[PDB]
Design a protein around this ligand. Structure first.
Ligand SMILES: Nc1ncnc2c1ncn2[C@@H]1O[C@H](COP(=O)(O)OP(=O)(O)NP(=O)(O)O)[C@@H](O)[C@H]1O
Ligand SMILES: Nc1ncnc2c1ncn2[C@@H]1O[C@H](COP(=O)(O)OP(=O)(O)NP(=O)(O)O)[C@@H](O)[C@H]1O
Ligand SMILES: N#Cc1ccc(N2CCN(C(=O)Cc3ccc(C4CC4)c(F)c3)CC2)nn1
Ligand SMILES: N#Cc1ccc(N2CCN(C(=O)Cc3ccc(C4CC4)c(F)c3)CC2)nn1
Ligand SMILES: [Mg+2]
Ligand SMILES: [Mg+2]
Lengths: 352, 352
């Protein structure tokens, strides 16, 4: 069978596919047409149907996995379109994680003789994260941070070494947020979570602005001024709140200037998109900061697809975590941030 | 001069006024007409202008303060209308706190010879809270909790004793949220804050529903179903997430069902109001829970006017704090929850 890892989330399905590149002449003969058709279909297309995408830039080339050499591919499509995926399958052992491995278990079993093995969402995440960092990103670091995140003329992406990754706080920003404390390869726990995550950003943005994609919401936010919607410390005090070291630019009340009708009438869609992004991102950083202090962990890595093509939120997290922790916490990011559960699922294949 | 305490917040001005009731016949002669006019105006009206309100039910009767007997009155009006208040004053020593004591300092000084003494927002809060609990609410408890907050047919407001109030976590829900750790009468600190507070509720509700008052937003929310907008754990998993003890009814992504256009087209304004209330209230409870665990404090008291006439949020906090802390934390509430800074300011009068 082809080697696949699937993470069926509330919003996106993530698929990791291992393409063997050491196929012998005998092995090519013995492979059935449908199997060759799948491999050709996946490797010769970068868009699948109308909503599937292969993230070609993330491909791991010439990886050794289960004693074979191949390329590891990363593919995503909306969970809404999983019926299309299953119908294509009907017209293999599947290691699957995420909530959808349970919700859609009966649907995967409509594919004859298919064996579905459900693996835990956060177990797969930890195993996939550790694995990808261990093999590297084609010789480059998988993990990075923003150096000098406080000064915009200096702030730059830089590699970060995770050769001894423990302990680690992992903040998984998907539809909502899960926060994990990882103490060893086999010792980790879910600290807490928040429901103010990527689905809140996308859902509120769509309600407030009429955007109809994540990418459109980010484009709007890049053009907006969140301070048109937010009430800042300086709006309440006239300046800093010196006694408690709160700068005048800090947000005192998210969307708090929208209690005034004249301000609601002047705010732009772009301002509202940016205020939504800032509100969600700052809350995620603050919850991560509080969890890191309680867990006594100083390295905080952010994963999940809320941060895909989202440098605004990454830089806001880098700056905010450093600033509000007085430099005690470090925001870390990973190149394959949305796919670790799918990789971890694939890595469970030998157990079956 | 009349004895007043003022807390000028980002949204509301709160005023505490001590009405002497032990006026002698000689003292009445020696009082100037304008002073008698103010006392008559304040005590014979419950609405002041178009936006000022006296909360008559909160009055403390026959209180001994600074060696005199009198009644303590509680009055509120929008900070937007402070120019009207100052103009009435122009056509006394003022102890004032809140951000507006700084922002509007120059405006108060347009009242001839008036002495403005700025006191710290959170110092006044702690002093006023301790004072009101100490004198009682006309013989009744100032502090209450919701007994059996998990079972709706049993859940009921009950008095709570704060005779030894330390330590205490104070969660001040105004425009935004400040979280204080109080270890003694003179030992307290601001732990952190969040910008997702009462102004976020009111501002987002107004944008999403067109409501034009706090009371209207609560009325809408009382009729709504937040699960029409929110994505629940059961929407992602098909049930509970057993491995991490997450019930199917828990919110996985606030507003997360609003990423689907057909759902945005069917959701009601009341559903959106209730989702806004639930989102903000749950986030406040979660941040309070994390701060209580880090501060090693088990009693969490919620104050500020986000909870005025807002039993929905109070009961949600009571239930959520108990449930998610597995019964280790207790949500406490106070009858005079919006006015403690104003009382604390008044209590600073002898220092001048
Ligand atoms: N093409 C996209 N479509 C939708 N959302 C996107 C897209 N790209 C990025 N996002 C964001 O990524 C989030 C989903 O991240 P992801 O980590 O894939 O979550 P999920 O696994 O589907 N949800 P969960 O069940 O909570 O783990 C969305 O809420 C958006 O904020
Ligand atoms: N009549 C009202 N008008 C406006 N907001 C109200 C009213 N009644 C209750 N509220 C709520 O109470 C919140 C303000 O609470 P309050 O404790 O008075 O804050 P504030 O002191 O003005 N702000 P801050 O500067 O952050 O301390 C608003 O954000 C609303 O959610
Ligand atoms: N990563 C990370 C990260 C990101 C943000 C963050 N913060 C957010 C801002 N904030 C506040 O206190 C907000 C505030 C300010 C002022 C008042 C009233 C006096 C008016 C409030 F009610 C509330 C500190 C914590 N913390 N961490
Ligand atoms: N007072 C108080 C109080 C109130 C609420 C509260 N919580 C809010 C809910 N919550 C979550 O984890 C939410 C969640 C659930 C599921 C997933 C993914 C698996 C799909 C998430 F990304 C996120 C626990 C903490 N905590 N405290
Ligand atoms: Mg996920
Ligand atoms: Mg206040």
């Amino acid at each position: 069978s082809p080697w696949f890892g699937m993470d069926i989330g509330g919003t996106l399905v993530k698929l990791s596919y291992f393409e063997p590149i050491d196929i012998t002449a005998e092995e090519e003969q013995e492979e059935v047409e449908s199997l060759k058709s799948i491999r050709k279909y996946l490797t010769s297309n970068v868009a699948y149907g109308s909503t599937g995408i292969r993230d070609v830039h993330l491909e791991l080339k010439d990886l050794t996995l289960f004693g074979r050499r191949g390329n590891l591919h990363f593919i995503r499509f909306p969970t809404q379109d999983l019926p299309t995926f299953i119908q294509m399958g009907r017209d293999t052992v599947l290691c699957a994680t995420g909530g959808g491995a349970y919700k859609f278990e009966k649907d995967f079993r409509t594919i004859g003789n298919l064996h579905l093995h459900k693996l835990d969402e956060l177990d797969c995440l930890v195993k996939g994260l550790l694995y990808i960092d261990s093999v590297s990103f084609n010789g480059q670091a998988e993990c990075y941070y923003f150096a000098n995140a406080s000064e915009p003329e200096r702030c730059q992406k830089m590699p970060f070494n995770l050769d001894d990754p423990y302990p680690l706080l992992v903040v998984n920003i998907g539809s909502g947020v899960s926060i994990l404390a990882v103490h060893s390869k086999d010792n980790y726990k879910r600290v807490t979570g928040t429901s103010l995550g990527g689905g809140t950003f996308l859902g509120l943005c769509s309600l407030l602005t009429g955007c109809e994609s994540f990418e459109e919401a980010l484009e709007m936010a890049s053009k907006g001024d969140s301070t048109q919607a937010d009430k800042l410390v300086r709006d309440i005090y006239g300046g800093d709140y010196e006694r408690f070291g709160l700068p005048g630019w800090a947000v005192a009340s998210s969307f708090g200037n929208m209690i005034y009708k004249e301000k609601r009438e002047s705010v732009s869609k772009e301002d509202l998109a940016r205020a939504t992004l800032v509100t969600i991102t700052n809350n995620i950083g603050s919850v991560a900061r509080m969890c890191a202090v309680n867990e006594k962990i100083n390295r905080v890595v952010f994963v999940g697809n809320f941060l895909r093509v989202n440098t605004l939120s990454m830089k806001l997290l880098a700056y905010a975590l450093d600033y509000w922790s007085k430099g005690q916490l470090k925001a870390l990011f990973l190149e394959h941030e949305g796919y670790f559960g799918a990789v971890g699922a694939l890595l469970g294949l030998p157990n079956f």
